[PDB]
Ligand binder design. Structure first.
Ligand SMILES: [Mn+2]
Ligand SMILES: [Mn+2]
Ligand SMILES: [Mn+2]
Ligand SMILES: [Mn+2]
Lengths: 194, 194, 194, 194
């Protein structure tokens, strides 16, 4: 069944950008809760789809999306962060330049749309295999990113930043680039491009 | 596996309120398509859930909701229509009077919200078990009627009326009350109160 | 133009249920921001609607809803909270009993749907003048409550509780009833019922 | 005040691809209704904004979006259709080849997503100024095409095809390319790149 993945670092290792208390709650309470609930829902969905209990299958969809999306998004998020993440691979940098002009333009554009999310959500850098281009997008709540492979996500649910940054979401979104795990992001890019 | 239910009457039995060409297309083409697509989508969902492919399972939700709702809604709709519908049961009529004042008030209010649907959708009379009251609502596309048991539905997708009524949706919505199957609606009401 | 209303109490007066820091940020940063942005948007919307700049009018809608809704909701919220709120009027209690059985059932049912909000949102007790009944509902983000008069709202955006309650939204939703301003809620009920 | 634009051709000029009865209803009934409703809704919105009645202004958003989008979309659609459409301009064809590989690939991809619309909506070819690329998208109902300038639209509301094509939407979507007004589409492209 689905399990809570261990973080690739210790709870305080992203300080001073994201605090120990945030990492601890975000992992041990929020992500844990999505996993526990997803397992209950997924079992129920398997039951209903097998038995052709259609009204119940349809009813279980929003909870599967929310908790499943929560599990997907946070699992990617933890791999996307590092105390010293390094720099983008030459192939990823070259592609960032091609599709956004520069890393600066990408960071600005993604930070801006992510900051602008109304309510809870996530910003994403992804790769679209069909049209062979990097794209940026936002998603409401825990809706998984669709139509492109995720590379780097920024959680802008208030629980992601509030204990440290309070209302100042922009400072958190700008600061998270300091701990972007470019090694991992580059690996995801390579994989999406095979 | 889901199957297309036979109509409880022949294709021309609802004339002049709904034409035989409409009933033929609506059942043999539209509903049949929802069933065929539903079966394929359920198969793909069962596979995704069995494999633990969470992103794939979530991605199938819109299609299951759309085709599953299509199957559910049209299945109900055929049972809700009759040339000889009869009258509400005393218990249903009494409840209509209690909750809407009169059958006249119910018909007007449900017709008005149904006529007002922007795009494709349905109008519903339903029964809420929790609060033991009749309610009316509309749903977009084939979205689920949430929190109430469906009693009587009015399809205002353009395919439900256009060949006969053209753009004049109101003439259709007002006329459908003439073929409401109150025997069926009363049975659904009795079941909902069990 | 729209202005930030003063709170009817001092920032620490709802302790220990809602902290001074939360009240201060919630009022001086979050609500202030909705007001400042609403004024900019409303001016732009007036411009576009007067000049028949239709694409721009449509584009400005989501920001008007979000900031306008923010202003509406928070203005009601501050009047809904008090250190000693009193008890519901006899007329409101009688109506709560009629429509929910008891205050306990109302509190449980409203707390449950409010707790269950996926992402950011609000829970509401309202009064529907058409069917002359109390109702409960939730709204996503800052979508104003529609179809009924608002009486009591519970903000479950994470900024409403996180500094104090962290992830434990249920404890905040249960505890807020301790500071429900029943004098104000009763007054809104009386007004909705004229 | 908004007005119903005359068609740039007579009602039967698009036969056998779109019937004269469809063109007549679509323009004289459907589009006319969007215009008439738009004018009324704009008036009510102007009044609400002038009065500072924020809840009322917000409540009018769905109707403005729906009728305003109806007016915008159909206005574009009439200019996008011609018996003698011609061929894309060299600059547009070159861009189609750059961004989709071929006109064949564009037509297939846009047709497929358009055919796949669940419920009422539209398919679009558009141009994104920011990234200087052509894109395709669908929109539900009359929702705005966001972030790109519309070039060519395909209405797949059932009223756009049902009298002629009945349930066979694909035959309509494949056939409409025969009457795409490439002169108009090329002009819109040139304007979008200014
Ligand atoms: Mn999170
Ligand atoms: Mn139908
Ligand atoms: Mn708030
Ligand atoms: Mn149309």
């Amino acid at each position: 069944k689905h399990t809570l993945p261990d973080l690739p670092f210790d709870y305080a290792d992203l300080e001073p950008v994201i605090s120990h208390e945030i990492m601890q709650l975000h992992h041990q309470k929020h992500h844990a809760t999505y996993v526990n609930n997803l397992n209950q829902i997924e079992e129920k969905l398997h039951e209903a789809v097998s038995k052709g209990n259609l009204k119940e299958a349809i009813a279980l969809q929003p909870a599967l999306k929310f908790n499943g999306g929560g599990h997907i998004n946070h699992s990617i998020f933890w791999t996307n962060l590092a105390k010293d993440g390094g720099e983008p691979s030459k192939e990823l940098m070259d592609t960032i330049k091609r599709d956004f002009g520069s890393l600066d333009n990408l960071q600005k554009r993604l930070s801006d749309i992510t900051i602008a999310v109304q309510g809870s959500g996530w910003g994403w850098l992804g790769y679209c295999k069909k049209d062979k281009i990097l794209k940026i997008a936002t998603c409401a709540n825990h809706d998984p990113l669709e139509g492109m492979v995720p590379l780097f996500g920024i959680d802008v649910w208030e629980h992601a930043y509030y204990l440290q940054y309070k209302n100042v979401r922009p400072d958190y979104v700008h600061a998270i680039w300091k701990i972007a795990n470019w090694k991992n992001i580059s690996e995801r890019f390579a994989n999406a491009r095979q």
